[PDB]
Structures are given as C-alpha cells and as structure tokens.
Amino acid sequence: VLFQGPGDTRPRFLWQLKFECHFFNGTERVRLLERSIYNQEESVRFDSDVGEYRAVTELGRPDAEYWNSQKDLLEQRRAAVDTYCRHNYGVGESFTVQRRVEPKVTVYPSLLVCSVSGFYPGSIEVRWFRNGQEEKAGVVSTGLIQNGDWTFQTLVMLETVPRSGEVYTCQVEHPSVTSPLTVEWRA
Amino acid sequence: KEEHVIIQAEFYLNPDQSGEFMFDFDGDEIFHVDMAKKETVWRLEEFGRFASFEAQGALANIACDKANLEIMTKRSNYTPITNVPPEVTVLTNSPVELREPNVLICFIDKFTPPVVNVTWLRNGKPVTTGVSETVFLPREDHLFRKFHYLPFLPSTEDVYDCRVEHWGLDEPLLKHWEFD
C-alpha cells in the first residue's frame, strides 16, 4: 500500500462486459461483438463474423481457449445474431430508427452563428447563403453534439464582416422535415 | 458505414463495489440498473415497458461481473487501472435569452475509473433543487461519459459553475457559464 498526496489513492480494478449489436441496412446484415475489458484493455471477444472467441491481449488467452472448448456455448453465441441482436431490434422502434424530432433553427451575430438545436436523429445538413449564393469559405462548426437526452445540437458559424443590404440565410435539412428550413438575418 | 448500434454494457469496480447494467442506442441510454440505488431507471417514459422486461435479472449479471473482476485482478498480478482525468464542457440546451427558461448541460467525458463528484454552483453555492444526472455511459475506447442538467432562467446577475472531482485531476475542475 502506498501513501502520498490526495486522500484515496487506493488502487482500482475495473471489469467491463459489452455486447454490441451492429445493424446494417435495417436488419439485413447484423454483426454481434461481445467484449471483455479489464481496466482499459480489452482482453477477449466473440466476433460473430469470426465465429469463435479470440484473445486480444495475453491476459485473454486462457479464456479464449477455455470458452472455445465449450462447443455448446459457441453454438449459442453463433445464433445470438438472431435470438439476441435481431430480436431486440424488433422490440423498440420507439427507440430504434423511427424517432424524429424537428430542429429549432435560429441565427444571431457574434461572425454569424446558425444555431440548430433539439433534433433527432443526428443526421443533418446546415448551409450558409449570402444573397442566394452559397458561402462555403469561412464555415466552421462546433460539431454535432449529443445532449444525452436523445436530442442533438450544433452551431455552424460563418465568418463575414456584414455589409448593409445583405441577406444571410441558414438552410437546414433533416429527416424530420420534408422540405428544408431556412432562417434569415440582416443588418 | 453501419446504421445503428445497440450496446448492452456492464461494469463492476473495486474496491468501491459499484457496478452497472445498461442498454444504449447510438450512444443514448435506453435504461440502467445501478449498484448504488438498485433501481431500474428508464431514460424516457417511452422505454418504461422495455426496461422492466429487460432489467429483471440485472443484479445477477453484475454479481457475475464482480466475480470475473476478482479472477482478472488476480490473474493480472493486481495491476490497477490508470486514472484518466475527464474533459468537461458546459453549454445550454438552446441559445440563451434573458428570462427565457433554458437548461445548463455539463458534459463530463473521456474518463476512468467511473467515479466522479459533480456539483452545480450558482453564485458559488451548490444547487440542490432541479438537478438531474445521467449514470456512467460507455465509450468505444472504454472510458466513460456523463451528463448533468439544471433547468434555469437566464439573467445578468446569476453565474454558474460545474465543479468536477476525479482521481486523475490534481484539483477540482471548475467550468464556468455566464450570460453575455
């Protein structure tokens, strides 16, 4: 046991176990990935595309070998792509693809900011226009931000020193609306 | 090129004896079970039925993970996790206007082990009323993330802080927000 500095320097040990169902094109292609992680190092996995356990690191070697010898277990994981993955995708569709929330779009100076907030899902496209003409230069974005509550936001900036008479337009395309949203600003 | 990912993520942690069992759709929590509260909690009401169905045996799953941790700890010669301090950001739900009710979000990201103290400070005092918080959410690189929320009414006088404590931090992190 070692003593220095801040209170509670006691060692931690952490074990994580993850089952990841990866869906491609509805459910036509599905890949199960079962992972074991000790601290920060993943040590062993079952990749449904590989068909058996494989050690990632040394510490996982005993497990891959041991679990692969259970011909029974392999059979059940090999079938999990249906019994677990596809089956669970079935349930939901309040959580799955179906969910749709429309963005709140506003435009305000700061550099012009186009705020697109509160939308779902996260596929979106935000464009800038000056007097009908798209401006691609000087456009940066904070990125797509997940709020943790099943909505996203993003800020898309346009750098300009505005000139009087000019009309700037932010245009937003998202699945929740059939036609693009547009919001303008002038000085 | 994939479309969707469902993740069932569990953890167990020593010597804290904390642990979790949760589901996750494209990075968003469907529901969790904690070892600290032993409650099954759905993120939105729409997931209520699903969560009851899928969480009835979650405590056993965590007990299994605990037992596997002890085998792995032993096998690794008591190699301890390396603390990784969180990145913290504070932003609002929507663009801020005076007297327009809004929501402060504190994002605590890219950290391990999954142990943090997060408090909201209004004018340097801790806020107890109205605060919500997420449990520890999983990441591809096997670190964690967390969200804390505070519904609030913007003003020129009020000033906010998200205070975060973590063993990878030399001292508490203070992320400031104010109206400008």
């Binding site: 005993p62 277990l73 | 037992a67 096998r75």
Partner: peptide, 7 residues
C-alpha cells in the same frame, strides 16, 4: 446464465 472466466 453467467459466462465465467478460466480459473
């Protein structure tokens, strides 16, 4: 069921 590590 519980998938237990090698002992």
């Amino acid at each position: 069921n519980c998938l237990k590590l090698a002992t």
